[PDB]
Design a protein around this ligand. Structure first.
Ligand SMILES: CCCCCCCCCCCCCCCCCC(=O)OC[C@H](COP(=O)(O)OCCN)OC(=O)CCCCCCCCCCCCCCCCC
Ligand SMILES: CCCCCCCCCCCCCCCCCC(=O)OC[C@H](COP(=O)(O)OCCN)OC(=O)CCCCCCCCCCCCCCCCC
Ligand SMILES: CCCCCCCCCCCCCCCCCC(=O)OC[C@H](COP(=O)(O)OCCN)OC(=O)CCCCCCCCCCCCCCCCC
Ligand SMILES: CCCCCCCCCCCCCCCCCC(=O)OC[C@H](COP(=O)(O)OCCN)OC(=O)CCCCCCCCCCCCCCCCC
Ligand SMILES: CCCCCCCCCCCCCCCCCC(=O)OC[C@H](COP(=O)(O)OCCN)OC(=O)CCCCCCCCCCCCCCCCC
Ligand SMILES: CCCCCCCCCCCCCCCCCC(=O)OC[C@H](COP(=O)(O)OCCN)OC(=O)CCCCCCCCCCCCCCCCC
Ligand SMILES: CCCCCCCCCCC[C@H](O)CC(=O)SCCNC(=O)CCNC(=O)[C@H](O)C(C)(C)COP(=O)(O)O
Lengths: 124, 459, 55, 95, 89, 65, 123, 73, 178, 126, 276
């Protein structure tokens, strides 16, 4: 069944089923073992992509749609829940930590010459 | 610089006068020493460029190449001793001489003060190359490939001829030294905007740009191994050397007249890198690898920042050595396999243990593994490109991911997997094949120890 | 049949890993970062014949 | 099903030959005809390294730099001779 | 050492014999190599599937479908297993 | 020379059992020894204050009005 | 995790503090001449003991002690144990403070809600 | 050494969990034919049930014995 | 792997090859053994009934609803043996299965040692060339009248003749090269 | 849930109606196709197992593939729509996209440098 | 990274619960522990993150080589399904495996305990995503679950391995290193924590349920899983939940993002960029 005549070059090259070498019977003694292709059988146009070390088209126990929806659903729910989180964070009943001097103004590398507005912390 | 050249010329008398049986060793042994004399130019204990004489000069940019041009003639003559060992004893001495003239001409072109000396010698190199590709080319299509290699370069060449004669009238001498120390500032007219394109286009063509690179895949495919080594290692870099010395003039326009090429090259880098991903002919994949890794160079010789330039100088010398190494090992598979197809010949490490180590190191040079000059080069072009526009990392970032994929795929489907059942049994590796490789990589290891020598004019 | 090569790559991995650990300038950190990546490629697919290891 | 009577003989016979091939693969006696150190690579490498670290690195500027040593309150500085003042007394003893 | 001792045919031979002697339907005192399953011992088209599967689990490998639609004789199993495992005795 | 066993409990070497009990018993000696010497796995050793028993004087809660 | 969050997120947050602004009210509010914190260590002592900026807390002083007894007593890493309790305590006695401050700010905010309504006398 | 193999007869389903599976299968009328093959799993040596505390607590007896002694000294 | 693939599949081999996938995909769900051996003799029951259906149409309607019941009640990670396609050791040792036509390019020094090995190898290569003629002729004289042609190859059928196209089923690289 | 083959995750052999077919015509093909394969198989198997052979088994089915894919393309090119519209969006589309991505950035950068905002601190290289 | 570290922790842990390959389960645990390591870096606690890296190395290395011992001793069986009762057949590795398993589950006074609970309570005390805080803790219970899955299926169950038995772990080269790392797994957390420089100013003051949360969640994680393992033995068909397969085939990220990207990235080169 020649590839459709739309003038993109395929020519007379057969339009062989788009199935990857992955599901070619893995036990049969394929002449070319690793391409799971026999000698003489028409090679597929994109056998450079269906090779085993590349893409696969091997039936999956779960339907593809079911997969795409489920995966992304999970992703979304998670991303969302993480957002519910940022909205409502978890923080202990503890006030802010208190650093000495002027919040270590000079040591945080502050300018020695210009003194900072004193930030004082009182007991209790 | 007439020791790197006169002794070279004398090689021609030796290839002809010498015995048919001893012709190969006299020529290869002597040019190895010719390379040793070439190493003297590296002795620059000061910044001043070394103006040997009126017509012949060598500055940091040319010196790293003249040595490579002299170095590959030995190797080219060692990689073509097999094919070309079936010839009539006068076809050989022609091939050997053709290879000899290429570096005589290329040594002079890279070591030329007058820009039109570059042009005459620049476009002469096509004669020796076209003969090597067409006369000894294995495939039916080399007549075609030769035509493509002659016309794309020639149509670009005549505009440069008009441009350089034009500047001589405008300034009064095509001497690279003076042109540099003289005020040639183009005036952003519509015409100048054409001059700039005239000068750069001929160089941009033999440095395959995305728009005009179809000549290189076709040429290296049917070219004999020696021609493919010369085209990838020295011939394409002739275009880069030209762009570095010609943009000294046309200083103002490239600030805004480069965008077209820069974008052509960076998008080109991605597409050329990607089609390598599914190309059945190994020589085809290396050639497009060469287009992409050379598309980075035209995008650094145009941004024009100090780092770009020496990123370029680092990568050009490095990629030159790596590409040949890849083209040389591709040939060794081609001669035993007898087909260029990548899919056949799977599992070779199982049968050719060492060639596979050379294949692995060549691929790691091909992709950017870090203690290699290849990476330093890309890291630098990448930096400047980022400076030009932070967004550039995206496109120079899709290329790095693709470059890793095709480089390893060449190793994974050629040198791993189950062995091919019974192709014509693959005779073991000759010591010549392995040395021809060792001679490519041992210098790649040594240069990576001291990158300063191939850093370019800028640094 | 190739125990010695396997041990050889394991120590090369350790050398790249430690270089990655103790690297002041990041260029050396890069040498380690890429370096363990390549030897992992060589060592994950030790048994090259198996396509699964290659994938 | 069951093997075809003419396939249980092409497996009959070819198995018989495989058994002989594997016997032939067996190597005859003689088949392969061939025609503290610890200190060694810990001490010898060491001398060299030291030679390198104490006479190149050490000598060159800013090649081996070290975080300042730690000095606490009440501990003496060997080089200058000063004794770091003891700190202000900790008032609380609450555990 | 860690790898077990290589199978010797006269062993593999006994092992396949043994397992069958533990299948209740197959008489333990008649199972005789060369005693075809469906013609002599009386097993059914569906038993064979299992008899093979037991063997695939006694020797730890899979007898492919097409090559196992024929493990009839209780011996074919003993040379096929051995041929697949390279036992030249 | 360990002998492969068919449908029987592999015979075990003296050393296999002793080394195995050894490593496990030291694990338990260490867990017990540290638990006794340093039982700060639970409570740390600092008690959480009840934030809801701080006299309004303690926190500066002015007398309403 | 905790109830405090439930108060703020569930129900109403009007009277629940915002962690980003814990001393939201006047610092002196509630205290005549409240005493400010005091640091035993010296801006230099710390700088000479190379204490990480973060570790320069009001317990920096008991830390320096620990670190002293950890350099001294080197081969023995299990003997500077009293020093660690002390540091930790100092810090527990700081975490508690940071908790007392949070509770005080909570209650004070409530004062506002109470007072507003009280002060919001009908007429 | 021409490894021998335990007598096939040795294996029997009674006394193992296969027997209870055997009896309920018999209630349905099924005969559970290959159950005898799966007997050595439960037959001997490996017959004892393994409890999760037993693994987590392996060696605890001496471990505590060791602890007490050390604590004493 | 050894025998050749039949052109079309019968009804039986399709049913009897489900009994394998099914029971083997029931031992991934029933990780234990007594549970399995139980839940499986219950499987046979399912296949045991509907064994004597003579109504093909029906039979191919029980089969087509069996393999859909199965597809939706299969385990995602089936227990596939270690050395079988899709396994964990599949083609692991293939990096050591060199193809044996490579010992022909060995240096006379290498083959100098290992002497008796090559004395027997040269015998076998004499066997191979000594019969290619009688073999190919056999392969041809026995080409059944043009028509259906299967990949099955003939046995020997005469003394001295070596069962044909045999050089690569015998002389196969050993499985575990180790 | 019925398995739903997508261009990927295709319909398995089982669950495929065609598999369940005995119409004598179908069986006819299924037995005709083995013949082509058996024929081709017995044309590979007594030419690869041939003593006295050194030449390269060619696998012409692979040579028909490469020729079809790199030297039988332009002789079968006819410029239609859906081919030239799609043959210009691919070559000039992104090439024009990035130009307004790089021009706008380079112009933003230049303006900022000109007005004096870009910090360019500790940048002593380029 | 606190957020993505958190997602990987549970995502990888949930996938590990149903994986039936012993090496695969340990590898997912490698990712889950690093997910916890990513979380501490995300909560800006660098020093403790490094502490877990060192402790993580000792026990994960042990469990892998422990399974290396089981896989090599058995006829290269890499599936928990066919491997059982290693505790009586091979006590030396089983002892090493449970030592490693408890370290992975943060058993009190073992190397995981010194660094891991510091990280847990750090979370329970900092200001963080609520979703991240909840997932990290159940991720900890799952670590106990899959840890439970390995020992129940691999060690405490009737044997299901192929009938001929040839097990030897006597080789010094097996024991010695396994023995040496076991000593490290038992004592390393003790040594590293005391010796390192005081850093991070931890918060040891917590309500007791947060102080002991890591311990309890780990305990019930195993408790719930043990209930599960026990459940299976019955002659009643449970199979698995609809989201169980979702778990077993790795969340379906492999099935979908590995078939689409490599397919729509290569199709565009051959069909569009190369030929067109
Ligand atoms: C290239 C320049 C070669 C110069 C060689 C000088 C020595 C000589 O006499 O060689 C002539 C050269 C070879 O001649 P011969 O040695 O006889 O072998 C080939 C016979 N056709 O045959 C030649 O005539 C080579 C020179 C051809 C003319 C172009 C020179 C440029
Ligand atoms: C194809 C690859 C790219 C080739 C580009 C070729 C460009 C045209 C040839 C070289 C153009 C050139 O030399 O540019 C400058 C020239 C005028 O330059 P200028 O010296 O300023 O003259 C005006 C004096 N007031 O401007 C010109 O020479 C105009 C040339 C007109 C002919 C164009 C080419 C026609 C080719 C057929
Ligand atoms: C592996 C990749 C290569 C790493 C090479 C590291 C050593 C490089 C080096 O510096 O050695 C040569 C050096 C030559 O002397 P020079 O460099 O002039 O030092 C003078 C200092 N005033 O030093 C000398 O030649 C003097 C004699 C030195 C002999 C011992 C050298 C030991 C070097 C150890 C370097 C280890 C680090 C690299 C490998 C890890
Ligand atoms: C594949 C990895 C992709 C990773 C993407 C990472 C994106 C990071 C954020 C980039 C976009 C925001 C940059 C913000 C910088 C500060 C704000 C700013 O002023 O942008 C700089 C400049 C102007 O952008 P803007 O403000 O949008 O003004 C547009 C006016 N028409 O910016 C501009 O010059 C204009 C364009 C801005 C947006 C450019 C979007 C680039 C898209 C890249 C696609 C990559 C894939 C392409 C296909 C590959 C496969 C074939
Ligand atoms: C009351 C006062 C009590 C005073 C003591 C308090 C308890 C102190 C306990 C410290 C224990 C330290 C220890 O036992 O180290 C063993 C070591 C730990 O792990 P390690 O291999 O060092 O790995 C960490 C590398 N940084 O692991 C190893 O080094 C493995 C060594 C293998 C060979 C050991 C052979 C003898 C085993 C004897 C065990 C007893
Ligand atoms: C929800 C979204 C979350 C955020 C996005 C997550 C995903 C981002 C992209 C991640 C990378 C996508 C490709 C990953 C690599 C890959 O998929 O290779 C696996 C492929 C098949 O291997 P697999 O099936 O996994 O294993 C065999 C089991 N029998 O093995 C192969 O060899 C496939 C072919 C690989 C070589 C060509 C691949 C294309 C190379 C260029 C494009 C690279 C991907 C696109 C650019 C980078 C995008 C980040
Ligand atoms: C867990 C996995 C779930 C799988 C569940 C499973 O599919 C349930 C099920 O198959 S439900 C019974 C279907 N059972 C048939 O489809 C057989 C009918 N087919 C015939 O009867 C034939 O006509 C023939 C005479 C050849 C039988 O003879 P034979 O036994 O093949 O030898």
């Amino acid at each position: 069944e020649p590839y459709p005549d739309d003038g993109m070059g395929y020519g007379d090259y057969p339009m062989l089923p788009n199935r990857s070498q992955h599901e070619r019977d893995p036990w049969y003694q394929w002449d070319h073992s690793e391409l799971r292709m026999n000698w003489g059988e028409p090679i597929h146009w994109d056998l450079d992509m269906y090779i085993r070390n590349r893409v696969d088209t091997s039936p999956t126990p779960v339907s593809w749609d079911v997969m795409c929806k489920h995966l992304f659903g999970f992703v979304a729910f998670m991303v969302f829940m993480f957002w519910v989180g940022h909205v409502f964070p978890s923080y202990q009943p503890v006030g802010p930590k208190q650093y000495p001097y002027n919040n270590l103004y000079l040591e945080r590398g502050g300018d020695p010459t210009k003194e900072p507005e004193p930030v004082v912390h009182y007991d209790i | 610089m007439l020791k790197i050249i006169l002794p070279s010329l004398m090689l021609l008398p030796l290839t002809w006068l010498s015995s048919p049986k001893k012709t190969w060793t006299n020529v290869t042994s002597y040019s190895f020493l010719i390379s040793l004399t070439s190493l003297t130019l590296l002795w620059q204990t000061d910044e001043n460029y070394k103006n040997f004489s009126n017509m012949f000069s060598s500055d940091p940019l040319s010196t790293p190449l003249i040595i490579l041009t002299a170095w590959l003639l030995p190797l080219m003559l060692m990689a073509s001793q097999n094919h070309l060992k079936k010839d009539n004893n006068v076809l050989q001495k022609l091939y050997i001489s053709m290879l000899i003239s290429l570096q005589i001409l290329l040594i002079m072109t890279f070591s030329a003060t007058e820009l039109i000396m570059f042009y005459i010698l620049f476009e002469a190199t096509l004669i020796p190359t076209l003969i090597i590709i067409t006369r000894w080319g294995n495939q039916t299509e080399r007549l075609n490939a030769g035509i493509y290699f002659l016309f794309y370069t020639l149509i670009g060449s005549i505009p440069l001829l008009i441009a350089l004669i034009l500047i001589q009238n405008h300034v009064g001498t095509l001497n690279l030294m003076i042109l540099s120390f003289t005020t040639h500032t183009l005036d952003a007219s519509w015409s100048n905007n054409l001059l700039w394109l005239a000068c750069m286009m001929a160089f941009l063509i033999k440095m395959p740009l995305y728009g005009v690179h179809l000549w290189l895949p076709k040429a290296h495919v049917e070219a004999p191994i020696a021609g493919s080594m010369i085209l990838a290692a020295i011939l394409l870099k002739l275009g880069s050397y030209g762009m570095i010395r010609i943009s000294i003039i046309l200083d103002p326009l490239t600030k805004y007249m480069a965008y077209p090429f820069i974008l052509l090259s960076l998008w080109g880098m991605i597409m050329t890198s990607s089609i390598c991903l599914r190309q059945t002919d190994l020589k085809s994949l290396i050639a497009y690898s060469s287009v992409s890794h050379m598309a980075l160079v035209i995008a650094s010789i145009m941004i024009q920042t100090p780092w770009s330039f020496m990123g370029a100088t680092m990568l050009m010398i490095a990629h030159g050595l790596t590409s040949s190494l890849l083209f040389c090992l591709a040939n060794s598979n081609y001669e035993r396999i007898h087909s260029r197809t990548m899919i056949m010949a799977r599992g070779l490490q199982m049968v050719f243990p060492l060639m596979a180590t050379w294949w692995l190191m060549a691929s790691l040079a091909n992709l950017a593994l870090p203690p290699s000059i290849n990476l330093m080069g890309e890291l630098f072009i990448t930096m400047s490109l980022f400076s030009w526009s932070n967004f550039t990392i995206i496109l120079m970032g899709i290329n790095i991911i693709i470059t890793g994929m095709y480089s390893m795929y060449m190793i994974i489907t050629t040198q791993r997997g189950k062995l091919t059942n019974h192709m014509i049994n693959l005779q073991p590796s000759h010591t010549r094949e392995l040395t021809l490789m060792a001679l490519h990589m041992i210098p790649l290891i040594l240069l990576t120890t001291s990158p300063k020598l191939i850093t370019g004019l800028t640094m | 049949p190739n125990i010695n090569r396997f041990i050889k790559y394991l120590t090369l991995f350790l050398i790249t890993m430690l270089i990655l650990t103790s690297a002041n300038n990041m260029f050396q950190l890069f040498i380690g970062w890429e370096g363990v990546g390549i030897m992992s490629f060589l060592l994950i697919g030790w048994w090259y014949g198996r396509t699964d290891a290659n994938t | 099903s069951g093997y075809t009577p003419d396939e249980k003989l092409r497996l009959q016979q070819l198995r018989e030959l495989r058994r002989r091939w594997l016997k032939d693969q067996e190597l005859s006696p003689r088949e392969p005809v061939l025609p503290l150190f610890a200190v060694s690579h810990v001490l010898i490498p060491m001398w060299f390294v030291h030679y390198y670290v104490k006479y190149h690195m050490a000598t060159k500027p800013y090649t081996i730099v070290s975080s300042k040593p730690r000095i606490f309150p009440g501990d003496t500085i060997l080089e200058t001779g000063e004794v770091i003042p003891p700190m202000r007394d900790f008032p609380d003893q609450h555990h | 050492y860690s790898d077990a001792p290589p199978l010797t045919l006269d062993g593999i031979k006994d092992r396949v014999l043994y397992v069958l002697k533990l299948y209740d339907k197959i008489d333990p005192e008649k199972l005789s190599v060369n005693s075809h399953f469906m013609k002599d011992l009386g097993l059914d088209s569906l038993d064979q599937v299992e008899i093979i599967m037991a063997m695939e689990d006694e020797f730890g490998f899979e007898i492919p479908d097409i090559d196992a639609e024929k493990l009839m004789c209780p011996q074919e199993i003993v040379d096929y297993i051995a041929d697949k495992k390279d036992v030249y005795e | 020379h360990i002998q492969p066993r068919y449908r029987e409990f592999p015979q075990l070497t003296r050393s296999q059992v002793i080394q195995g009990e050894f490593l496990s018993s030291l694990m338990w000696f260490w867990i017990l020894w540290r638990f006794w010497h340093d039982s700060d796995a639970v409570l740390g050793h600092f008690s959480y204050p009840d934030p809801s028993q701080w006299t309004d004087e303690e926190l500066g809660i002015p007398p309403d009005d | 995790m905790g109830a405090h969050l439930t108060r703020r997120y569930l129900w109403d947050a009007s009277v629940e503090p915002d962690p980003e602004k814990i001393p939201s009210f006047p610092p002196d509010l509630g205290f005549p001449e409240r005493k400010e914190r005091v640091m035993v260590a010296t801006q230099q002592e710390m700088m000479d003991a190379q204490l990480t900026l973060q570790q320069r807390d009001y317990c920096a002083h008991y830390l320096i002690r620990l670190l002293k007894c950890k350099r001294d007593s080197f081969p023995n890493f299990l003997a500077c144990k009293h020093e660690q309790h002390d540091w930790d305590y100092c810090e527990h006695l700081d975490y508690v403070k940071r908790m007392k401050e949070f509770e005080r700010e909570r209650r004070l905010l409530q004062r506002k809600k109470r007072r507003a309504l009280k002060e919001a006398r009908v007429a | 050494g021409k490894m021998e193999l335990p007598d096939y007869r040795q294996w029997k389903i009674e006394g193992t969990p296969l027997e209870t599976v055997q009896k309920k299968l018999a209630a349905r009328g099924l005969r559970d034919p290959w159950a005898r093959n799966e007997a050595w799993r439960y037959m001997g040596g490996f017959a004892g049930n393994i409890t999760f505390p037993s693994v987590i607590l392996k060696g605890f007896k001496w471990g505590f014995a060791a602890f007490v002694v050390a604590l004493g000294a | 792997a050894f025998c050749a693939p039949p052109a079309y599949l019968t009804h039986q081999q399709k049913v009897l090859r489900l009994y394998k996938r099914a029971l083997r995909h029931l031992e991934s769900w029933c990780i234990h053994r007594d549970k399995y051996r139980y839940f499986a003799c219950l499987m046979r029951a399912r296949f045991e009934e509907h064994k004597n259906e003579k109504d093909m149409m029906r039979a191919t309607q029980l089969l087509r609803e069996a393999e859909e019941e199965f597809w939706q009640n299969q385990h995602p990670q089936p227990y596939i043996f270690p050395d079988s396609p899709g396994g964990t050791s599949f083609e692991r040792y293939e990096c050591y299965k060199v193809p044996e036509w490579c010992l022909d390019y060995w240096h006379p020094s290498e083959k100098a040692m290992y002497p008796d090995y090559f004395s027997k190898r040269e015998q076998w290569k004499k066997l191979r060339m000594e019969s290619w003629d009688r073999e190919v002729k056999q392969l041809q004289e026995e080409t059944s009248p043009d028509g259906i042609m299967t990949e099955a190859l003939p046995p020997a059928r005469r003394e001295g003749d070596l069962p044909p196209l045999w050089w690569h089923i015998v002389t196969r690289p050993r499985e575990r090269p180790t | 849930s019925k398995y739903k083959p997508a261009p990927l995750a295709t319909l398995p052999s089982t669950l495929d109606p065609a598999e369940y077919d005995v119409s004598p015509e179908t069986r006819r093909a299924q037995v005709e196709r083995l013949s082509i394969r058996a024929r081709l198989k017995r044309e590979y198997l007594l030419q690869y197992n041939d003593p006295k052979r050194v030449s390269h088994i060619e696998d012409p089915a692979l040579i028909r593939w490469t020729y079809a894919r790199s030297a039988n393309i332009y002789p079968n090119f006819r410029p239609t729509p859906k081919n030239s519209l799609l043959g210009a969006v691919a070559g000039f589309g992104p090439l024009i996209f990035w130009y307004y991505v790089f021009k706008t950035d380079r112009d933003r950068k230049e303006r900022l440098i000109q007005e004096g905002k870009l910090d360019r601190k500790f940048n002593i290289s380029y | 990274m606190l957020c993505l570290g958190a997602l990987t922790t549970l995502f990888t842990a949930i996938c590990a619960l149903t994986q039936n390959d012993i090496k695969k389960i340990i590898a997912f645990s490698t990712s889950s522990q690093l997910g916890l390591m990513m979380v501490t870096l995300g909560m800006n606690q660098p020093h403790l993150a490094f502490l877990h890296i060192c402790t993580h190395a000792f026990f994960k290395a042990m469990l892998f080589m422990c399974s290396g011992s089981i896989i090599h001793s058995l006829a290269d069986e890499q599936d928990i399904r066919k491997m059982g009762n290693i505790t009586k057949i091979m006590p030396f590795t089983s002892s090493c495996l449970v030592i490693g398993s408890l370290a992975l589950t943060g058993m009190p006074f073992l190397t995981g305990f010194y660094s891991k609970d510091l990280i847990i309570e750090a979370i329970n005390t900092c200001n963080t995503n609520a979703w991240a805080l909840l997932i990290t803790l159940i991720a900890t219970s799952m670590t106990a679950m899959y840890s439970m899955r390995i020992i129940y299926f691999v060690t405490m169950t009737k044997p299901r391995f192929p009938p001929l038995i040839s097990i030897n772990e006597n080789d010094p080269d097996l024991m010695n290193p396994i023995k040496r790392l076991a000593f490290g797994s038992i004592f390393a957390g003790f040594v590293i924590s005391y010796n390192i420089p005081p850093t991070s100013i931890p918060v040891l003051t917590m309500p007791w349920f947060l102080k002991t949360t890591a311990l309890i969640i780990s305990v019930l994680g195993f408790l719930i899983a043990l209930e599960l393992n026990n459940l299976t033995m019955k002659l009643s068909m449970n199979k698995a939940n609809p989201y169980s397969s979702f778990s077993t085939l790795l969340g379906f990220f492999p099935s979908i993002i590995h078939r689409i990207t490599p397919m729509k990235s290569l199709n565009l080169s051959l069909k569009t960029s190369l030929t067109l």
